[PDB]
Amino acid sequence: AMGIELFVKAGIDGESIGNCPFSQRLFMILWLKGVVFNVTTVDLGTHPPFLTFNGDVKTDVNKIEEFLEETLTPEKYPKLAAKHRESNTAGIDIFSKFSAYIKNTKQQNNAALERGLTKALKKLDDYLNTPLPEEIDANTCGEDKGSRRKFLDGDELTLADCNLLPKLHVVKIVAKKYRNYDIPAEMTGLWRYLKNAYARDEFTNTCAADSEIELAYADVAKRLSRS
């Protein structure tokens, strides 16, 4: 549990944080562990973020996640794994539906691709509004018999949030910029969750700027040119 050097994507100015949900994932985990670590922004290009632990390189973000959760343990470090399996699968198809949506150039497919994104957002909204069994037991449910928990697994950030929140933020920023798409406000559980994340330094201070996320997709997101 020493000598941790994180390497994340650099923004256009060479110093600030670039757009990379996987970089922010690892940045959030390390921060939420309370471990001492340094972070460096580098070009990276198409390469994934990575870290060194006591001078040994660790690669592959999912393997890095397991290594950190197994190496930084109680009592000195908190366990961050979600306790509910549904927390690990909630929202899993959102990024892929968003990507297919912003990449299509045919106006004929836009409505179906938008409904697919909206539906995948709605399943995530349902999970965040359905009370977890401990909330029902604790009678901590909202007056509407709905969940008021702050994040996927409970009121604490878990590894599943470190995965999903960077991607969901990118979806919000990019779908708005390049399709004028708004995550419906009636998705109150999804919006409660995003705003809970925006209120936490661990997300906000590891986040790439709005302009950075939008510019990073300027070649990826396509205009509805063809019919």
Author numbering: 25 to 251
Verbatim from the authors:
Chloride Intracellular Channel (CLIC) family members uniquely transition between soluble and membrane-associated conformations. Here, we expose the function of CLIC5 as a fusogen. We demonstrate that purified CLIC5 directly interacts with the membrane and induces fusion, as reflected by increased liposomal diameter and lipid and content mixing between liposomes. Moreover, we show that this activity is facilitated by acidic pH, a known trigger for CLICs’ transition to a membrane-associated conformation, and that increased exposure of the hydrophobic inter-domain interface is crucial for this process.
Of note, to facilitate the crystallization of F34D, a small flexible loop (residues 57-68) was removed (CLIC5–Δloop). Importantly, a comparison of the CLIC5-WT with or without this loop revealed no functional or structural perturbation. Similar to other CLIC proteins, CLIC5-Δloop-F34D consists of tightly packed TRX and α domains, connected by a flexible linker. Despite the marked functional effect conferred by the F34D mutation, the static high-resolution structure of the compact conformation reveals no significant differences between WT and F34D. In contrast to the crystalline environment, CLICs exhibit structural flexibility in solution, with an elongated conformation in which the inter-domain interface is exposed. First, to assess the structural effects of acidic pH on protein dynamics, leading to enhanced membrane fusion, we compared the HDX profile of CLIC5-WT at pH 7.5 and 5.546. Under acidic conditions, the TRX domain, as well as the interfacial region of the α domain, exhibit markedly increased deuterium uptake. This increase likely reflects increased exposure to the bulk. Thus, our pH-dependence HDX-MS analyses support a population shift mechanism, skewing the conformational distribution towards the elongated form. Importantly, the transition to the elongated conformation involves the exposure of the hydrophobic inter-domain interface to the bulk, providing a mechanistic paradigm for the triggering event necessary for membrane interaction, initiating membrane fusion.
